[PDB]
Design brief:
homodimer, 181 residues, alpha/beta, Rossmann fold, five-stranded parallel β-sheet, 53% helix, binds chloride ion, binds cesium ion, transferase, Nucleotide monophosphate kinase, dimeric
Chain lengths: 181, 184
């Protein structure tokens, strides 16, 4: 199997590009599982995450519970069956939003995640980099820059794309990075 | 403020004793806040934990999110106001059930907890100990939990007070009072 994720602010186009990728790979003959966070593990998490004035720790722990179930019950079984599994959002979303955005310590985030994810990391992550005003502007600037920080740190895994480019051009770039895999 | 917890199997009497402890403290003119886990932070987590079959990891993390909210929105504010806060269940429930019971690694559980709880530990925890039969194949999980609680207690004898929960309710209550009185 092959694990791929898409990341970015809401309205960055990462959702569009996840489905375009899923359809492209399917046309190459490859079995695909398209999924998303939050809700891919525990659909009821989407309710809890909207709680008024939720602490950043509680918000991250809810994302993590969802992720734990998502990895165990959906993603790992899909990879085991030889599928390309594509998730619209994964752990980097939490690192960018709860870590860089809300100020939680990244090492704690990663330690929680290590059991939650069983260490599962995608082979490639396509980050759609969107100017924060096109998404709490201060918050969104922190999240945007946090994503870029994550990408600088794991340049093997991240492919950073300009989300202001036409949808078709971004899809072609994504396809070009995959062809060799 | 003073933070106290009660622990044990469901049907151990922990809930009755949490109520009697709050009553004792009220009779001493001490402001008291009685609370509980799960659901004291995020009520929907309790609802989910009742109906959903989850991995042990996901179960723990949901309990942890509830606990994070409970600590920040209920317990710490109670303690800040100078109340004695009594929780019916706290972190030791997760360690015994999800750690000893379901098999999750205890160091990881405690690393998660460290930020979730902001390091807040109770001054005393009253463990209402009894065999699961006093609260065939289903008993093995509960035996693990029981022995897990006892393992926790013997590792922190300064914090834990272990009571024989099969004793009459008034005798247990009087034992809890006697242990608490030096925190006068
Ligand atoms: Cl999007
Ligand atoms: Cl009880
Ligand atoms: Cs890359
Ligand atoms: Cs675009
Ligand atoms: Cs916890
Ligand atoms: Cs602290
Ligand atoms: Cs003690
Ligand atoms: Cs009893």
């Amino acid at each position: 199997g092959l694990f791929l994720t898409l990341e970015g602010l809401d309205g960055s186009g990462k959702t569009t590009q996840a489905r375009r990728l899923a359809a492209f790979l399917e046309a190459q003959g490859r079995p695909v599982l398209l999924t998303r966070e939050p809700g891919g593990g525990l659909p009821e998490v989407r309710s809890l995450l909207l709680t008024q004035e939720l602490s950043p720790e509680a918000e991250y722990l809810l994302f993590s519970a969802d992720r734990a179930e998502h990895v165990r019950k959906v993603i790992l079984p899909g990879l085991a069956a030889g599928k390309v599994v594509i998730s619209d959002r994964y752990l980097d979303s939490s690192l960018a939003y709860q870590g860089y955005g809300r100020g939680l310590p990244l090492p704690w985030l990663r330690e929680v995640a290590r059991e939650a994810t069983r260490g599962l990391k995608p082979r490639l992550t396509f980050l759609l980099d969107l100017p924060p005003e096109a998404a709490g502007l201060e918050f969104f600037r922190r999240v945007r820059e946090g994503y870029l920080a994550l990408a600088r740190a794991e340049p093997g895994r991240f492919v950073v794309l300009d989300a202001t480019l036409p949808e078709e051009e971004i899809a072609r770039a994504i396809q070009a990075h995959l062809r060799p895999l």
